[PDB]
């Protein structure tokens, strides 16, 4: 459930965000982890491309990374708006709560709580919420887204352109378808448707276309 | 975070709460877990003290598996309600996702949950939700709760008786306280206061007481 690799992720977004350089001992601190442990975290992580240890021993994220990461702090304060705003957990304790939550929530569960929520702009705890626009807010495819179943759706876208073829356209226109446109778608081829118508377609367309888603 | 231990727990109530026997190979089929893997896990915790291979070689919880078992389903059943009621998550996606939420929940989470949603009575598949009263609805211590912071818481218861011482018682008463109341507490010692017042305590008361918470 948990990944080791999103909590090491995350990590280093967050001292990134505060103006800190990301160095190894600030992350084995921060994770109360051993220098060792994270010495053999990191050489796992840099073989799947998620981190590159940079000329002057700091960590750079990857683009990959980057967009892993990224998803793990708009999870954690999508949870924390939850927790506040609907829920009324003692704001004492609406962090670590999050820590655990910001592993185990689906995409989609994000998509229907920027519906229900008023302001997704900010945690609580003052800081933006990243990566609204990979959620249509190219895609986405439707393829892939378708689924079966149918549905529806728306677309847106478708392309055409581219285609080539054509043809278808026409167809577508016819039917119408376209774108825106619704439508439806478926796957079964695828287808678508418207119207009615258807358509169917192819493939291319578916593929392409785308778508867205509504 | 996910402790498997609580997923075999959970997989043997819900088994048994279906008027089917908890035999070993019900359990590796749902869990999608080879006869040898589920063997060498039973038979760590039946050395904590959690379950008992049965004279008929079916798997009794003991006390203590029995309470930890309720509280997750508790849990689940609470996230499923706060899933559909609130969240408006597509209900084909409802269980899923539940059971991954139900190890991170915090049973802070579930005394707000109480008390935001109307009816805690059954889930939306219509079964009880269980343990209510080990949560004041002895415990818781304060111590534990406490814390520191202060806170307040408440208471418840103391005691006283027892114691021894006283012284215180017174113181317580013055213051016052007581128981119921408420208260604050815390621590620082412790305490407590109321009124014013304060107381412181002591340790015894612390411790006791318780307480619860408010
Ligand atoms: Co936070
Ligand atoms: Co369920």
Redesign the pocket.
Known sequence: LVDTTEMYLRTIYELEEEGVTPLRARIAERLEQSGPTVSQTVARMERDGLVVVASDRSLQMTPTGRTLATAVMRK??LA?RLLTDIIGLDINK??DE??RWEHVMSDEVERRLVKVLKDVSR?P?G?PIPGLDELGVPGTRVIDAATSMPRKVRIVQINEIFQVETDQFTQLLDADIRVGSEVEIVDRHITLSHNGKDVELLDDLAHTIRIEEL
């Open positions: 954690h304060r924390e609406v962090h999050a820590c945690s705890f800081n």
